């Protein structure tokens, strides 16, 4: 349904959609703040759907899923000229463990997108956003600072979790809409052990194709170095219909947002450069506009942004305020944003493409395709360059 040679992905994220995350969708969360104080806002999905109980949870969520996107998204990103969207999910929507305070009813509207998808021949990645014990303590897997799939049964009901989606999305029936199923997204290598994480990587892919499924298996790079998975799932193994998924940002360290904007630059189109040189496909699954982490609750609940020195021991380059509504943008950010977006474009569409995250937010403009698509600062058509070749790629 897809060459991966010879097309290129140009696709969003459909995130904070089945695994809420607070800097999406603040005003699920905000509810829960008392005045100025945020110490009693839950800080991911487990919590919040702990903190409300059941039934207030499903009834909460069965607004947010049937209004954050609906056909009408998808008709759009169409019109945009998107040939893809990614979309996370949560192990949740499949199986609970025993005592998680999830609640299901996701699945319905995922398969309602297949179709919405099918209908705007629109492309789709279902992306594992979270397994059980959390991959990589993040928000977006669902359960914040803890680091146990690799631990008890969590593997195991992983893969177990991975064989449902295999079965119902992996087979014929939507064969001409989904050409890719991530594993798992953004396993955190460096507190893994990337022996067990391989294996599991290679019994998701065996699982798959045992059942008969000719489905692009997506892995993601594990914040790994360009080439680390060059040996891994070869053709020369006889494992194939395999694509690396990188996902690149700069402001998420110190040293990362202290680049000026031509270092920035650099640093992007360097990302092409190095991703031409990998053996396996590889698409860029989740990039942004963003130079800088000030969007509220970027780095979690309760967390300040390094940009104005106020978390992860960070030097204060900037004050947040300012940057935190689009119209209030100095023309200098709105070029510098503009310019950064099209280095990007052009080093990701050198090799398999890139989907952008995400499609729409509340209210953070840098990590919303719509927001920066309507004020211009996205190229439409999406290969207009106010900046022509920033990289020079040969």
């Known amino acids: 349904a897809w060459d991966y040679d010879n097309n290129v992905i140009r ?48 009834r909460i969520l069965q607004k947010h899923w049937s209004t954050w996107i609906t056909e009408q998204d998808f008709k759009q990103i169409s019109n945009l000229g998107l040939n893809f969207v990614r979309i996370p999910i949560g192990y949740w929507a499949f199986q609970l463990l025993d005592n998680d305070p999830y609640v299901q009813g996701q699945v319905q509207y995922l ?10 021949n629109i492309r789709v990645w279902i992306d594992l956003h979270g ?11 669902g359960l914040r600072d803890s680091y146990n799939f690799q631990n008890g049964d969590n593997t195991q009901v ?33 507190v893994l052990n990337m022996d067990k994480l391989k294996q599991f990587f290679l019994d998701g892919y065996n699982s798959l194709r045992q059942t ?7 892995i993601h790079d594990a914040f790994q170095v360009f080439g680390y998975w060059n040996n891994f799932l070869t053709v020369a193994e006889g494992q194939w219909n395999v694509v690396v998924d990188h996902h690149h940002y700069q402001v998420f360290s110190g040293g990362e ?75 200098e950010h709105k070029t510098d944003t503009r310019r950064y ?19 729409k937010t509340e209210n953070a403009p840098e990590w919303s395709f719509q927001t920066l698509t309507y004020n211009g600062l996205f190229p439409q058509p999406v290969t207009d360059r106010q900046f022509p070749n920033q990289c020079g790629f040969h």
Request: hydrophobic share 35%; net charge negative; proline share 5%.
């Open 11 to 58: 696709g969003v994220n459909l995130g904070g959609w089945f695994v809420l995350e607070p800097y999406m969708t603040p005003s699920l969360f905000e509810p829960f703040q008392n005045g100025n104080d945020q110490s009693g806002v839950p800080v991911d999905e487990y919590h919040w759907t702990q903190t409300l109980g059941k039934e207030a949870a499903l």
């Open 341 to 359: 977006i099209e280095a990007q474009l052009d080093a990701f569409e050198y090799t398999g493409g890139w989907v952008f995250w995400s499609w």
């Open 257 to 331: 947002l202290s680049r000026n904007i031509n270092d920035h630059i650099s640093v992007a189109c360097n990302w092409g450069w190095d991703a031409k040189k990998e053996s396996h496909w590889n698409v860029a699954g989740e990039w942004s506009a963003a130079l800088t982490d000030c969007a509220k609750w970027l780095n979690g609940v309760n967390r300040g942004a390094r940009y104005e020195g106020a978390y992860d021991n960070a030097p204060y380059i900037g004050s947040c305020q300012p940057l935190l509504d689009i119209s209030q943008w100095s023309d």
């Open 158 to 190: 992983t893969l177990n979790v991975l064989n449902t989606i295999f079965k119902k999305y992996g087979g014929n029936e939507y064969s001409d809409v989904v050409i890719g199923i991530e594993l798992l997204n953004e396993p955190l290598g460096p």
């Open 212 to 218: 008969g499924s000719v489905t692009p298996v997506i």
């Open 111 to 120: 398969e309602k997108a297949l179709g919405w998808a099918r209908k705007n």
């Open 131 to 141: 397994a059980p014990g959390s991959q990589n303590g993040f928000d977006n897997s």
